[PDB]
Amino acid sequence: KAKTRSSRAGLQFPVGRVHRLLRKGNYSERVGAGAPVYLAAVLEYLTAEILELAGNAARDNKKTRIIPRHLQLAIRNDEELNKLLGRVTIAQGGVLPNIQAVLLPKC
Amino acid sequence: KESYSVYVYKVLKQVHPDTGISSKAMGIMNSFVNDIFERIAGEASRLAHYNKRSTITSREIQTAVRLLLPGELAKHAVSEGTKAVTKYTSA
C-alpha cells in the first residue's frame, strides 16, 4: 500500500524528497509530476559513475574503503568529469602525480 | 532534508558490493549531489522565465541536462532519465 514513487521509477534516490526541495526551493510557481522523477535518475547516474571509478581507484591502491584521495583521482583522470568539476576544490584531495617532461634528468 | 548518505551507500553497494566509504568521503558526495541539484534546478528555472511559463516539467530538465553535462554524460543521462519517466507513468 505504500509503494514509494521512487520504487515505481526503479530508482534509489528519494523522488519525494526531491519534489519537496523543488517546491520550497523557489524555482518556479509549479513543479510538474515527471520533473522530480527525471531529476532523481540523473543524480543517481552521476553518483553511479564516480563511485564506480573511485571504487576502481581504491582497488588499485589495495584498499576496500573509499577515502577522498580516490575521489580526486577518479574525477581528474577523465575529461568529462574533469570538465564538469573544473572549478571544484576537494577537501583532502591532493594533486595528480604530474611532472613536466623538461624537469627530468637527461641521459 | 539532512543528507543523502543512505542513498549514496545504496548505490555503492549496488556497484561495488564489497568496497566501503569513509565519513569524509561521504561528506564530499553529499556536497556533490547538492551542488548539481541547484546547478540543474537553478538553470531549469531560468528556462521557464525565458519561455514565460510557470511549471517545471521533465522537458524543462532534459534540456537543462543537455546544457550542463558535457559529451557522453549528456547522451547517457538523458537516456537514463527517460527510462525512469516511462517506467513511472506505466506503473
Binding site: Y45, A48, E49, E52, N77 | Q14, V15, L73, H76, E80
Partner: peptide
C-alpha cells in the same frame, strides 16, 4: 555487473 550498458567506459583500460 550492476549497470554496464547504462554507464560509459569504452576506451580505455587504464
Amino acid at each position: 555487473h550492476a549497470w554496464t550498458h547504462r554507464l560509459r567506459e569504452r576506451k580505455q583500460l587504464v
